[PDB]
Amino acid sequence: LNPIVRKFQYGQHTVTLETGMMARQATAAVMVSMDDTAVFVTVVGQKKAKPGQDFFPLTVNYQERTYAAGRIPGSFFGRPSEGETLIARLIDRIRPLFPEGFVNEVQVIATVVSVNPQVNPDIVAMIGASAALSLSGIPFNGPIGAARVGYINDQYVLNPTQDELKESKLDLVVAGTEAAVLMVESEAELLSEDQMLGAVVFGHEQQQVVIQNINELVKEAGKPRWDWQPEPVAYRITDKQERYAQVDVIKHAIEKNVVRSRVLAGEPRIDGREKDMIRGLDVRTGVLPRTHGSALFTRGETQALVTATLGTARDAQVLDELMGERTDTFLFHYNFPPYSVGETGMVRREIGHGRLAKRGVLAVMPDMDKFPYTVRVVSEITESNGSSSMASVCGASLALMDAGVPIKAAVAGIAMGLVKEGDNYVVLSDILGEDHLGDMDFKVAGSRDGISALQMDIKIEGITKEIMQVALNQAKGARLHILGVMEQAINAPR
Amino acid sequence: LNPIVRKFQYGQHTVTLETGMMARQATAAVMVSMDDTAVFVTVVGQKKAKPGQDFFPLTVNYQERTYAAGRIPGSFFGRPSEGETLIARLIDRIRPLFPEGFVNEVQVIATVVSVNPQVNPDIVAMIGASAALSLSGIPFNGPIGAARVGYINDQYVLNPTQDELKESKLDLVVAGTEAAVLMVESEAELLSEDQMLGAVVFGHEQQQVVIQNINELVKEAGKPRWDWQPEPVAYRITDKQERYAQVDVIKHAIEKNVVRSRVLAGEPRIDGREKDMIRGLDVRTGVLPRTHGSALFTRGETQALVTATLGTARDAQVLDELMGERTDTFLFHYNFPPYSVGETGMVRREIGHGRLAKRGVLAVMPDMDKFPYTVRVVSEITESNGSSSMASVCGASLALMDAGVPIKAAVAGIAMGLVKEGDNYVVLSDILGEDHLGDMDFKVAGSRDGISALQMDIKIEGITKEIMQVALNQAKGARLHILGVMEQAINAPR
Amino acid sequence: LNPIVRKFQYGQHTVTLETGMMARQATAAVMVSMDDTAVFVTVVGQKKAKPGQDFFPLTVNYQERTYAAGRIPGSFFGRPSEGETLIARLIDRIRPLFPEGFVNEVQVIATVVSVNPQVNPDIVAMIGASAALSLSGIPFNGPIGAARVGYINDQYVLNPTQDELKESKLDLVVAGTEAAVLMVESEAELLSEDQMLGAVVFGHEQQQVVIQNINELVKEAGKPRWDWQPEPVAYRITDKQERYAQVDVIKHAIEKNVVRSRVLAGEPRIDGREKDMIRGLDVRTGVLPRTHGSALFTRGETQALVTATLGTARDAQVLDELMGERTDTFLFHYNFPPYSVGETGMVRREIGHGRLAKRGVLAVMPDMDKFPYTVRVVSEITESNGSSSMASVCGASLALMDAGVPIKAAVAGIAMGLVKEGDNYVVLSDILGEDHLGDMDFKVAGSRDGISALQMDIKIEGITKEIMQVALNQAKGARLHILGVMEQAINAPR
Structure with a gap:
């Protein structure tokens, strides 16, 4: 057996990228450790798609093992928890990087196997999922970086710990490729528009070291690229209930393009509004007795x-x-x-x-x-x-x-x-x-x-x-x- | 937004019927309040039925929100409880009012959003389900009334409270149309045959004020009637296991009619019994050791x-x-x-x-x-x-x-x-x-x-x-x- | 109603076989009691199989009712427990006795209805499942016996109680027909090879009294035999991932026979090994930080x-x-x-x-x-x-x-x-x-x-x-x- 190990400094900590030793039967498996916080991420993509599959099937499974913190599970927690589903959502929100027409079933499984109480495994799992998809060979226009941005003493802090957070005015999570930002999820204590936007740009710039180090591992231990090629090439209806029923023609790409152009040119929207108009508001208070x-x-x-x-x-x-x-x-x-x-x-x-x-x-x-x-x-x-x-x-x-x-x-x-x-x-x-x-x-x-x-x-x-x-x-x-x-x-x- | 509100005296209490403001995308949605006990009932019926659907699909979902009593849910109660399924059953048992041949999928969702500890939300939900189906336009031969009958001091009491019940010898629930009774569910302290039957007739007479007030709301705010029309037009086998196996002909309406007439005329039943005969009885006691x-x-x-x-x-x-x-x-x-x-x-x-x-x-x-x-x-x-x-x-x-x-x-x-x-x-x-x-x-x-x-x-x-x-x-x-x-x-x- | 009761001495205890009174609508139902430990076992086999069914569907359901021990269930235990699934597995592991080509759906349901704290219901349920399948008429090459073997004071003990077990060096469960052993599941305190094999032979010899007594009940109260007849009649690929992908021919019985003969003759296995060779071993210790x-x-x-x-x-x-x-x-x-x-x-x-x-x-x-x-x-x-x-x-x-x-x-x-x-x-x-x-x-x-x-x-x-x-x-x-x-x-x- 031969493990390929690459290490780098991400912010304050040291991130370890390990592959080629564990779970070889999967398309790609990466062991990502960030200061003792280790999340094992796997990816499996099926070779042949189901004949006439209408949508792209992607499933992200995030699971936290309690032995990671050195604790034995209690009589209580099959089904994933509220927090585990949210972190699996943070990973999934990699989806728009698969080329248009790619319809093969692909499952990404991330498991927290070791954890440091000061380093959040959610960013670690996102780096592991980015590394797995890039080393797999599956058509994927990455790799993406993963960054958490804090705001302590009017200055942006890269990947703040749980103790630092307590002093932070912002809990921002940003993910994107080397060219553009793709995903942002923020929590803030009434900060201004420029302070929020400044954190998105800051986090995208800092996460570039993650993308570069995965790319080098890809050139060193990455599997060959997949042999896949894409197959070569209602106006005045304001009410949503009335529009959707009468749109069902017996006889989607044209349905997008028609709305696209009728907004790019600068004419009334589907319901009949200007670009900066808000719908009718009705506010009521005290509506339920008991x-x-x-x-x-x-x-x-x-x-x-x-x-x-x-x-x-x-x-x-x-x-x-x-x-x-x-x-x-x-x-x-x-x-x-x-x-x-x-x-x-x-x-x-x-x-x-x-x-x-x-x-x-x-x-x-x-x-x-x-x-x-x-x-x-x-x-x-x-x-x-x-x-x-x-x-x-x-x-x-x-x-x-x-x-x-x-x-x-x-x-x-x-x-x-x-x-x-x-x-x-x-x-x-x-x-x-x-x-x-x-x-x-x-x-x-x-x-x-x-x-x-x-x-x-x-x-x-x-x-x-x-x-x-x-x-x-x-x-x-x-x-x-x-x-x-x-x-x-x-x-x-x- | 415009809410249509109609109020009436049902027994001791005041029943409020409210529609046209909440959940407009559904076929019909009614807010029914009976002295601070409010149950929001919705109904959705699909326009086109699945080609070659063999049975009528009806689903009644009854759910109790704990914030209705002003309490926060505990670490414990996805799946409905034992009591919630029973009340959803009390509503469902509206089913035989849909015309023969109606096969469209229809779901009724009733949620308790406000509750008075003395007024049972089960009757409130049944009135809401009757109002929703009548205002929807969906082919439905209602509306039905909902009544609870008590028996305090040898006299029938309409909708007794939880404190009154303690003094009651009967907990009867009766539902039916303006012409005939459809559903009865009773609990009694060894009462006679006439006392039980007297409660069914009493409850059916008292619930007529509910039917009349829904009908007026139907004439005022009811949606147009649906454009639906119906499509135009083993004797000596006593053992059930032997009968069902040999009845599977390769080649239901005739199977009903043949049994129907052979009982209406007054000849031996399917198994070979008279109209008032009980099957063979075997009683054993003390059959399991530990x-x-x-x-x-x-x-x-x-x-x-x-x-x-x-x-x-x-x-x-x-x-x-x-x-x-x-x-x-x-x-x-x-x-x-x-x-x-x-x-x-x-x-x-x-x-x-x-x-x-x-x-x-x-x-x-x-x-x-x-x-x-x-x-x-x-x-x-x-x-x-x-x-x-x-x-x-x-x-x-x-x-x-x-x-x-x-x-x-x-x-x-x-x-x-x-x-x-x-x-x-x-x-x-x-x-x-x-x-x-x-x-x-x-x-x-x-x-x-x-x-x-x-x-x-x-x-x-x-x-x-x-x-x-x-x-x-x-x-x-x-x-x-x-x-x-x-x-x-x-x-x-x- | 007529119950057919047959009793016999299995080891220390008395085993009661009862049928013909309870659950007559099922193909066969047997009430098996072993010193106050009673497990009611049923079996249902469908007459006609689904046209073009590719595999044999067998489901064994083992459930423990708490009223058997004279106790009322607590706010806690739909889904079966960890132990109930294991005992259902011990029963299921009867599967290879159904003739090749038998594809009819058959379900075996065993419920513990009475229990003695010293007599384990798992052996009782296995005897009941063997009796049910033999009395049913369903093509089944049994009946099988069920035996638990202990090891107290350097001597084999048949069906040791929970108190005896504490003194035993072995907890072996053995099941098989009159000709050969079929299932073994053992737990031992570092015993030798001959001591483990001696327990398998001992248990198979002692369980013969169970097979004989079921066979007599079969001749007395057994239903007629089913009218079923069977329908008349990659070498150097070492890597499992590479072999399975390229084996998918467009165009199983020949796939078995080719491997069968290439091992019977005495030539290199599928991956290229001798009959007594172990695969490459990699041992690592201390692999996860926290x-x-x-x-x-x-x-x-x-x-x-x-x-x-x-x-x-x-x-x-x-x-x-x-x-x-x-x-x-x-x-x-x-x-x-x-x-x-x-x-x-x-x-x-x-x-x-x-x-x-x-x-x-x-x-x-x-x-x-x-x-x-x-x-x-x-x-x-x-x-x-x-x-x-x-x-x-x-x-x-x-x-x-x-x-x-x-x-x-x-x-x-x-x-x-x-x-x-x-x-x-x-x-x-x-x-x-x-x-x-x-x-x-x-x-x-x-x-x-x-x-x-x-x-x-x-x-x-x-x-x-x-x-x-x-x-x-x-x-x-x-x-x-x-x-x-x-x-x-x-x-x-x-």
Whole structure:
């Protein structure tokens, strides 16, 4: 047996890339260690695809073994936990790098086998997944880097530890290729637009050492490239329920292109709006009798019914996590029933949308010194047509004020889209479920003073920081418009 | 946004019907509030049915949110609970109102969003489901009413509260249309046949105010009616295992009609019995060595092996329910394995049959003052050919006496069927799995003195109370015959 | 109703065979009681098989009812437990007795309905399953006997009780027909090869009274035999990943026969080895930073990453089992991911392989007097190509020594195969995943002095004890070769 080991300095720590010894039957297997935090990541891609497979099947499995921290599992935790699904989501969000037409089934399995309580295994697993896909031979336009950005003493900190974080005003996670940023997931204490954008650029520049070191391992121990080639080559309908039913022609690529051009040229959108227009808002407070705090927020065809519950300090959820024991005082829940889009089925991505809406509200939540009560917020999505997660942020803010929770300020969220081909681009405000037919979509949540949460999902090459500068500026004026309408129905708690 | 609100007095309380504001993407969504008990009920019916769908797909989902009582969920309760499935069953049992030939997939989702501890959300959810289906436009021959009937001081009480119930001798739930009763589910402290029938008629008369007020909301805010039209138009085999195997012709509507007429005319049934004849009974006691209390009850081709277990007061199941904390001292379990009907599969309706058999025994169970021990009863269905739930009632009574539990009296159950077309009708005693091919089926469980449980399922228009008067009278003499045979093998506890 | 009862003396106890009274709708149902330990076993075989069914579907369901011990189930235990799946596996391992070409779906359901704390229901369930299949009429070349063999005071004890076991040096379970042994599952305190083989022969001779008494019940109350007749009638590829991919011809019985003859004649195996050659070994210790005890064991194309965890006496798993309360101080876990064989899927037989590897290590584990700490061992199968369970035994031994656990000696495991047709036979050492294409496969785990675990799976008629004598002797020299290589990398704990 022969192990190929390559080491490098990523920020403060030393990252070890190991392959060729363990799990050889898989397409590629990489042992990535970052100061004693080791995550074993594997990748398997099937040679022949199922004849007439309509979509690209990608599954990312992230699992935390408790023996990594030197502890024996308890009578309690088959099914993955809430946190494990979120980190598997952070990895998956590598998906748009597979070439268009690639339909082979591919599974990425990342297991935490050793852990340091100060080094978060989520970045380690993302580096391992990037190394596995690049060494595999499977058509993949990487490798990507993985970076966590902090903000201590008005300066950006690369990969802050759990102790450093406590002093940080930002918990940003950024992933992207050598050319452009692809994934961003941020949590912030009401920071400005430039401070959030500065962290995205900073993290993308610092993660370049990860991409270079994987590329060298690829040239040294990488398997040959796959023998795969791609196969050679409703206007006035505003209501989503009425549009989708009459669009079912007996007889997708043309459906994108027609909407694409009718926004690039600069004419009315699908529903009939200008590029920076927000849908009709309906705000209601105190809608359910026998609850503490309740709120109904409606934005065009997207609606969320949100509630708040006050409990004692003993009602706090004690989460036994791998990194350490953690007591959660603020709880957030997200429900997405099939009737929200007019469908029948099982009573998705609820964990991802729930945490995103939680991060948009967490920054404005009061201290345990001023408010020593366990607060739980549940969002019920009654209607969905564009970003029900940001509607939960608005609904939570009104529900907390209805309950009597003295939050620092009012908080709102907004979804933004972007269409680009040449030098000309258009940033759209309050996008419809427009989301599929685009280049990038990003959600900004924050108060009147700053930003609490920022999520980005880019799929196009060559987005400049000047284009994102303008994109966040329109997003700022978008949420200020929502907060102005919110400020009228409910302004103060109790 | 525009909410349409209609209020009315249902009994003691005020019922609010609200629609047109929440969940507009669904076919219909109704917010029903009864004195601070609010259940949000939605309905979605697909426009086009799956080509060549053989059965009518109906799914009722009832869920209780804990924030309704102003409480935060605990580390414990995806899957619905035992009580939530039973209430979803109470709603579902609306099914025979969809026109014959309607095969479109339709899902009804009812969620308890606000709750008053004195007003049971189960009746509230049934009113909401009746309002949703009527406002939807989906072919549905309603609306139905929902009523709970109590019996305090020899007088019928409409919708008794949780405190009133404690003084009631009856917990009856009745649902039906403006013309006839459709669903009954009763629990009683050994009441007479006329007292049980009087409650069914009383509840059907009182629930008429619900039907009228939904109908007015339908005329005001109801969506247009659906553009749907229906498509235009083994004798001596007594053994069920031998009949079903040889009936599989290579080559259902004719199979019903042939049995229908051969009972309407007045000739021997499928197995060869008269209309009021009970199958062969086999009663055995003390059949398992290392149990407390054990009993084997056989009725023709239906068999149940039942056991009893004695435990301390600490072994009682503490059920944290939405309405309040509840300690259960009498436990009942029901098992329906695939071999009971000669099939292979997963190791259905066990919760419904388990509670029905529990309600048939609960009335005869001794007090905690005379018997302060936690008693658990488990029924194992070894054979099934007609009503294994009533066989569990007989089996439980013998198992309790074998264990040494001093029950008030012996208790037995019987399933009854009815075939009707003109003025001539025939009520059948101890029906075979005859159940599918009929108009109504009802199960009566009780002692020699009174009735402990009464369940009804009607699917035909125009059943008079005089026909039910005769039907319950034959059911009385049926269980007295079973109790006479039971009284011989086991007569006294200890 | 008429029950047919036959009783006989099996060893110390009295075994009751009862049929014809309970569950008549099933193909056959038997009530088997062994001194108050009663297990109700049913069998259902469908008459017509699904047109073009490619494999034989057999499902064994073993379930333990808690009312059997006279106890009421607690708020805790749908899904079967760890122990229930293992006993269902002990029954299933009857499978090779169904004639070749029999493809009908058949389910065997065994339920423990009464239990004596001194008589293990696992042997009782195996007798019941043998009686059910023989009385059914379903083509089945039985009946089989079921025997547990102990070793107290240098003498073999038939069916030792739970108290006797404590004094036994062996916990062997043996099942087979009147002609030959079929299934063996052993746990031993470092016993010699002849002592283990002597127990297999002893148990097969003692279980003959079970086969004879079932056969008499078959002649008395057995259903007629089924009207079923059978339908009338890559050399140098060493790498498993390279062989399986290029073997997929467009165009199994010939694939077996070609390998069969090329081993019977006496020429190089599929990978190119002699009959008694072991694959290349790679042993590594201390491979994961932030664990207690860690080990990587590689054997050709089979690899296992194993870890050990040290905890306090309070961290011990308290297993509330049917026979009694049991505290487990040594924990073993087994993981089989899809990438171990180069596949994509859900993240099988892990419980069976986990317990087999546990039994191979349990004998060498130190006492609670010398080492009063809870030890947990987890095996991660990174590569699989022949017997990843025995690779876990080797990996566990090195991981315990790395953790500092003072185990009595070093322990290793080896998988063995056998090919036979005439008087000439060949026993193979360290078989590849060769396992499907054979007559019997057996795994021997033990130290330098004795044997800790012995599992056998025979599918052929006429294996003499002299052939097994030679087979275990080659297995002895096989594990001594592995222990010699292991003894070099890691020799002492701490």
